[PDB]
């Protein structure tokens, strides 16, 4: 089997990407941020704290014929960005753009943190790192793709997020017609439950090329490229007027600036990032400060390949018994 689902920005800077989901019978439609940095399937629900819930699609797993308590089951989650939530837990009929899990853990959310709230276009998420980060208690659930891998045609599924545009979610097979040249592939550690890997340098602009081996996930559902403290001052030290604000919570350019690209190794192959990718426009509504989308990892204690990164690519998440990680320019 195979699927494939239509990725959209949530807003005009790409802060994140939804991608709608059918859950229960009949259906029930959630627009989920696909989450290659976590592994827990939640949603917003007839069980949510009614003052917690301001426009979000809900699930009702009473209208549901096939969902299953189960029973004894709870979850909690906090993110590396300080929300959280938790709840219980059923198990229901899952698919996505065409592929369907029976039996699938569906976390409902009894309580969910301020950020979430005050997002009303992610109705929840959808975990697709390993399995062993699902925080289900006291018998841990498995990802969507870890249920869907063996009725796979092949046990991959990639990730190809638009800029400022739609994109798209494979699930079983590589769209040879999304990329160009090859897919350079590069080794996984999943010892930390993250599709983890490790880059082989960076290039600043029309800069050299330096060779220095970068660690970090590949994360769909983290928005900004973090990385080295040392990375990110080159970078930054390339646009006139960038500093790194305390208040604001990172690196900040003059809107004016025209940014540089940046360039990251996979293998002996590069991904070129474009200048825009990189402008997360305004601090604040009318701010002539705009936010920039290469931050420091330091203090996250992992470099963090998110959306800014990863939309500049075709991503192949490889699910074989030794997981790869796939990349192409396109």
Do not use: C, E, H, R
């Given at each position: 089997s195979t699927g494939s689902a239509t990725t959209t920005p949530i807003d005009s800077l790409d802060d994140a990407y939804i991608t709608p989901v059918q859950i229960g019978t009949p259906a029930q439609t959630l627009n989920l941020?696909?989450?290659?940095?976590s592994s827990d399937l939640w949603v917003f629900s007839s069980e949510t704290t009614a003052s917690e819930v301001d426009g979000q699609t809900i699930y009702t797993?009473?209208?549901?014929?096939?969902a299953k308590l189960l029973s004894g089951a709870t979850w909690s989650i906090s993110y590396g960005d300080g929300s959280s939530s938790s709840g219980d837990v059923y198990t229901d009929t899952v698919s996505v753009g065409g592929l369907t899990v029976t039996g699938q853990a569906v976390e409902s959310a009894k309580k969910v943190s301020s950020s979430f709230t005050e997002?009303?276009?992610?109705d929840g998420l959808l975990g697709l790192a390993?399995?062993?980060?699902?925080?289900?208690?006291p018998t841990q659930q498995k990802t969507f793709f870890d249920n869907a891998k063996a009725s796979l045609d092949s046990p991959v599924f990639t990730a190809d997020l638009g800029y400022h545009a739609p994109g798209t979610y494979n699930f079983?097979?590589?769209?040879?017609?999304?990329?160009?040249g090859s897919i350079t592939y590069t080794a996984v550690s999943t010892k930390q439950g993250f599709w983890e890997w490790t880059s082989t340098g960076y290039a600043v602009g029309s800069g050299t090329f330096k060779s220095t081996s970068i660690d970090g996930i590949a994360d769909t559902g983290t928005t900004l490229l973090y990385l080295p403290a040392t990375v990110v001052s080159a970078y930054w030290?390339?646009?006139?007027?960038?500093k790194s604000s305390s208040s604001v919570g990172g690196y900040v350019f003059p809107c004016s600036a025209t940014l540089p690209s940046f360039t990251f190794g996979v293998g002996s192959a590069r991904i070129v990032i474009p200048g825009d990718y990189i402008d997360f426009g305004p601090?604040?509504?009318?701010?002539s400060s705009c936010f920039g989308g290469i931050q420091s990892s330091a203090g996250i204690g992992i470099n963090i390949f998110g959306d800014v990164a990863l939309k500049a690519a075709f991503v192949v998440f490889n699910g074989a018994t030794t997981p790869t990680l796939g990349f192409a320019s396109k």
């Open positions: 941020d696909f989450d290659t940095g797993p009473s209208k549901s014929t096939t997002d009303s276009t992610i390993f399995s062993t980060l699902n925080t289900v208690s079983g097979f590589i769209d040879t017609t999304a990329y160009t030290a390339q646009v006139s007027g960038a601090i604040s509504t009318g701010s």
